C-alpha cells in the first residue's frame, strides 16, 4: 500500500474523457427528460444502453430461428396496478352481458 501511494500511476482506460461532471442541464435549459438543473445521473443512460444490447441479442436469435427461450431469473416489478386482473374482471362482465 505504501509502495502504491509512493508510485505514480496511470489511468486504467480512456473513459475519463467522458468528463461526467460536465454532463449537466442548465437552469434555463429546455427540459430534455426529467432531469433537474445541474449534473445529470447516468442510471437511465446505462439502463437504456443495456436495453439496446439485450434487444439486439434477442432479435438476433429471432432472426436465426433459435428456440424461443427467455432469461428466467427474477423480473423486477415496474408497476403498481393489477391491470391484468381488473381488465379480466371487466371482460368477464362483458361476456356475461352478451350471454
Amino acid at each position: 500500500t505504501q509502495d502504491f501511494l509512493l508510485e505514480r500511476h496511470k489511468p486504467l482506460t480512456r473513459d475519463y474523457r467522458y468528463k461526467w461532471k460536465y454532463n449537466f442541464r442548465g437552469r434555463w435549459s429546455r427540459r430534455i427528460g426529467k432531469h433537474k438543473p445541474g449534473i445529470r445521473s447516468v442510471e437511465k443512460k446505462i439502463r437504456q444502453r443495456i436495453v439496446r444490447i439485450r434487444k439486439r441479442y434477442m432479435g438476433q436469435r429471432i432472426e436465426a430461428g433459435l428456440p424461443p427461450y427467455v432469461w428466467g431469473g427474477p423480473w423486477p416489478q415496474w408497476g403498481r396496478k393489477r391491470s391484468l386482473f381488473i381488465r379480466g374482471e371487466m371482460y368477464r362482465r362483458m361476456l356475461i352481458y352478451s350471454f
Binding site: I62, G65, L66, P67, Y69
Partner: protein, 98 residues
C-alpha cells in the same frame, strides 16, 4: 403493390377480421382431421396445417419445462396442458403493513 400499401396519409392499415377468421362460417382449426374433408381432398389438397409452416419465419420447438414465449408456435388464446403448472403472482401493494 396491392394492399401492402395504403395510398393515402393513412400510416397503419385497419382491416376487420376475415370471414375465415370469424367463428360463424369460419374455418375450424381442427376440421382438417375430419373424415369428410379428407374424402373430398383426394390427391389435390393436403389439409395438414403443419405443411404450411414457413421455415424462414418459425423458430425451433423449445422445451416446455423451461422459460419460453407463448407466441412462437401456439397461435391461439389458451394454454396447452403440456405446459407445466404456472405460478400466479399477486402484487404486494402494502409491504409496510407486514
Amino acid at each position: 403493390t396491392k394492399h401492402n400499401l395504403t395510398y393515402s396519409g393513412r400510416v397503419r392499415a385497419f382491416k376487420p377480421p376475415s370471414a375465415a377468421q370469424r367463428w360463424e362460417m369460419g374455418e375450424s382449426k381442427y376440421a382438417w382431421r375430419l373424415p369428410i374433408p379428407n374424402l373430398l381432398a383426394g390427391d389435390e389438397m393436403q389439409l395438414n396445417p403443419a405443411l404450411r409452416i414457413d421455415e424462414s419465419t418459425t423458430q425451433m420447438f423449445p422445451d416446455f419445462s423451461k422459460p419460453f414465449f407463448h407466441n412462437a408456435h401456439f397461435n391461439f388464446s389458451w394454454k396447452p396442458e403440456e405446459v407445466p403448472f404456472q405460478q400466479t403472482v399477486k402484487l404486494d401493494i402494502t409491504p409496510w403493513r407486514r
